[PDB]
């Protein structure tokens, strides 16, 4: 609100909280990050390193669509399956008929490898994977299938 | 309700007085104030009156009776701080002071109803004053000039020094 704004408490004090000597002016140090190279050099470096200058090639018309790539760590892998069937699937590891997880339908781009999945057969259908995410699920017996 | 209420309501019971450790220690008088010494009244109706001290009371006060026949000052009680003792001492063993006590000096009953809005000495007071002065006059007459001394008032001279005076 306004009644708690300390300017209300400050009311009566001549400087209103901005000092008798400084006598708060309009814009003392300029506007914005003005003078980042003249009189603000140190703040623009000792707090904001790597401010002035560029690096890396300039991507023209970079479309976020191509670089859509949600991360699905193997611990989060079992989240996709519904909770009611989650426990049903943790027990009764059915290599004969094992559940599939449609990360693509779940809109999860690439399977990563945080690890520690229970040794159960799980079919994974994702756009991308890692080296060891394959290995860890292979160790648990699960196979991974690739869908764009 | 232009003033709602105080929530925390203060108590109404009076907590009893603390059991204070104070006692009625008896009064100890001075060295110059001895039964039979000649006193002078300082403040009151009879300022400057020579009198003789008779007996300290349990009322921590001095029963004083200058001879009413002499000084016109009858028997009564005064406060210790308001009397100056004189080395002049008379004999009081020959007079009895047994029946002078607080209830005998009960002034009168005062309340908030029987009050004299607008504005009678007891007879017995005279005779006991008489019987006291019987021996006292016979006693004071044993030494010269003391009757006149007890008759006369007392007043300071010019430049006389109480700090240097020896009573």
């Amino acid at each position: 609100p306004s009644r708690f704004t300390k300017t209300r408490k400050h009311r009566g004090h001549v400087s209103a909280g901005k000092g008798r000597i400084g006598k708060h002016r309009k814009h003392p140090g300029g506007r914005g990050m003005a003078g980042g190279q003249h009189h603000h050099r140190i703040n623009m470096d000792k707090y904001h390193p790597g401010y002035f200058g560029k690096v890396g090639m300039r991507y023209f018309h970079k479309q976020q669509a191509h670089f859509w790539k949600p991360v699905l760590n193997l611990d989060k892998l079992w989240t996709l399956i519904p909770e009611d069937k989650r426990d049903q699937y943790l027990k009764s590891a059915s290599k004969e008929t094992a559940p599939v997880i449609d990360t693509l339908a779940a809109g999860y781009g690439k399977i990563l490898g945080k690890g520690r999945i229970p040794n159960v057969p799980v079919i994974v259908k994702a756009r991308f994977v890692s080296k060891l995410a394959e290995e860890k699920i292979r160790a648990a017996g699960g196979v991974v299938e690739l869908i764009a | 309700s232009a003033q709602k209420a105080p929530k925390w309501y203060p108590s109404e019971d009076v907590a009893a007085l603390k059991k204070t450790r104070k006692a009625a220690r008896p009064q100890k008088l001075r060295a110059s104030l001895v039964p039979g010494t000649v006193l002078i009244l300082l403040a009151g109706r009879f300022r400057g009156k020579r009198v003789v001290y008779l007996k300290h009371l349990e009322d921590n006060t001095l029963l004083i009776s200058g001879p009413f026949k002499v000084n016109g000052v009858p028997l009564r009680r005064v406060n210790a701080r308001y009397v100056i003792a004189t080395s002049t001492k008379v004999s009081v063993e020959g007079v009895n002071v047994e029946k002078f006590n607080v209830e005998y000096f009960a002034k009168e009953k005062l309340t908030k109803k029987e009050k004299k809005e607008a504005k009678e000495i007891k007879a017995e007071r005279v005779e006991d004053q008489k019987v006291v002065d019987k021996a006292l006059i016979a006693e004071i007459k044993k030494t010269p000039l003391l009757k006149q001394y007890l008759s006369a008032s007392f007043s300071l001279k010019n430049g006389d020094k109480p700090h240097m005076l020896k009573f």
Partner: protein, 127 residues
């Protein structure tokens, strides 16, 4: 005849006036800091007004007490007095300005019969 209290002292009775309020008619009488730098009264030159300080506070067992010995408490109707009736010893009822005379008479009659001390019994009386 209320609950006896420690002997009363306000510890500074004189009311606090703003510096130089006397010589200017546009200086509000109500006390304030006067927070200038040159201000003599901002730091208490001996021989000048002492600004209010804690040490001028009253005793806790006397705060909000009348010199008569009551914590005053105003009222506006009979029902509001009912919350007080048991506490005649400590609080004193008081009538507000905005109460009609014919309302005052029934209030005072009720209060006096209850023995509740009242602090403006002589206001807006009809004679």
């Amino acid at each position: 005849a209320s609950l006896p209290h420690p002997k009363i002292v306000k510890k500074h009775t004189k009311k606090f006036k703003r510096h130089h309020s006397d010589r200017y008619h546009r200086v509000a009488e109500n006390w304030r800091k006067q927070k200038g730098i040159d201000s003599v009264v901002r730091r208490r030159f001996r021989g000048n007004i002492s600004q209010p300080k804690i040490g001028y506070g009253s005793n806790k067992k006397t705060k909000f007490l009348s010199p008569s010995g009551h914590k005053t408490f105003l009222v506006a109707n009979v029902k509001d007095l009912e919350t007080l009736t048991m506490h005649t010893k400590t609080y004193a009822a008081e009538i507000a300005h905005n109460i009609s005379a014919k309302n005052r008479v029934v209030i005072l009659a009720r209060a006096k019969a209850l023995g509740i001390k009242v602090t403006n019994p002589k206001g807006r009386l009809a004679l």
